[PDB]
Amino acid sequence: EVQLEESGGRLVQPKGSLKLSCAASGFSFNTNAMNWVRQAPGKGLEWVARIRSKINNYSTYYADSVKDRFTISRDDSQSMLYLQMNNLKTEDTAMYYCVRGTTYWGQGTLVTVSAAKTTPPSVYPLAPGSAAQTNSMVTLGCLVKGYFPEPVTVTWNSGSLSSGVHTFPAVLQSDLYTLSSSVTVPSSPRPSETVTCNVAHPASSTKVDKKIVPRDC
Amino acid sequence: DVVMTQTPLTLSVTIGQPASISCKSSQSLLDSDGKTYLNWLLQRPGQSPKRLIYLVSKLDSGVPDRFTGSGSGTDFTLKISRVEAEDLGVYYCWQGSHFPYTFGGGTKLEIKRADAAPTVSIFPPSSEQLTSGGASVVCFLNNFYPKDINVKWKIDGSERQNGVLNSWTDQDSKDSTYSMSSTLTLTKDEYERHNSYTCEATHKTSTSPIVKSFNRNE
Ligand SMILES: [Ca+2]
Ligand SMILES: [Ca+2]
């Protein structure tokens, strides 16, 4: 199958530089025009750069906002598309997609341009105080506070608990993100069967497990 | 640059009902070679965009016949004969005729479902957090519809407006419902010199709000 895998995304300081990569497979890369398209957090798609095939002498095109700063290139021998980004600005913060023509999009790689520094989150369990006894369903959660940059992923019981999970998108308050996740299980499992959220902040190489324990005295 | 105008910004449709979305260009997309490079893409939540239509009306492989692309020059239409749950997401038109290759602003297709009251859960600050010097009180408002809800925070009967952070999930993949998280953050000191913490949920499903509360020591 056609596969496009972007690599490179991370936190860069304003005026900094970053090179993105895209590994293409399952098609004749060397005969295709390739594009970079970006999407700013919660925004629409924005076309960035285009590179033609060798037959068209690798002609390059750029959106006005990135022209002279961004460099699109390709290595046909390795089926690799590249995006070198110099003099980065905060408004360049986006998810960057590798696109074969106008047909197939990769998964995307997140680029954060900010003066804020990498900060691992604090992981807080959400356990009911003294809430309703004969409540057939029990809701539990995890509060993931004070991290940067995005993303953060939450998983429950190492991915076993899938149903009943509500993962809330992160909200940036003061150069720090806050996210929460909830899990609804029958009153038969928890407390008897333990409930743990698995939090991952790849940017700070943080992997934290928090067991949800009933509220003590 | 060619300006691509998409309308409506959002629409709410019942599964099995038709949908029609517009895309207009500031100049004709009919290219020098006689072909019109107008694509329709769907971005499902958490997914990357997927092209549905190309060359105005050509359906991509494995794209249901329920989708129809039409128009010419500057006026384009994407029509869905009857919507299915999997149609939910943001639709984009993308022109490839003139450089720079522009996109429309997007149209968010939402799934219309029956109203449903939220189920409300309240959570006090964890010990982990109190030890760290902060105190956050959380409220989960689960599986409600419509999205529009108001959450009021009350400390010892008195309304607090600052330090409140709200987040909504996307429509549930099976339900089409929303869930919401409401976090009240205050200092460990402020939290400890107060006993009653309440979050009040006012949703169209009832005139009376859904109240959930806790007391530091009980
Ligand atoms: Ca221009
Ligand atoms: Ca052209």
Residue numbers in the entry:
A (entry chain H): 1 to 217
B (entry chain L): 1 to 218
Task: Copy out sentences from the published article reporting this entry, exactly as the authors wrote them.
Patients with cChHD possess high levels of antibodies against the carboxyl-terminal tail of the ribosomal P proteins of T. cruzi (called the R13 epitope). These antibodies, as well as the murine monoclonal antibody (mAb) 17.2, are able to cross-react with, and stimulate, the ß1 adrenergic receptor (ß1-AR). To study the structural basis of this cross-reactivity, we determined the crystal structure of the Fab region of the mAb 17.2 alone and in complex with R13. In the present work, we report the three-dimensional structure of the Fab fragment of mAb 17.2 determined by X-ray crystallography, alone and in complex with its cognate peptide epitope, providing a description of structural changes that occur upon binding the antigen.
The mAb 17.2 was shown by flow cytometry to specifically detect HEK cells transfected with the human β1-AR. In addition, passive transfer to naïve mice induced some of the classical symptoms of the Chagasic cardiomyopathy, such as repolarisation abnormalities and first degree atrioventricular (AV) conduction block.
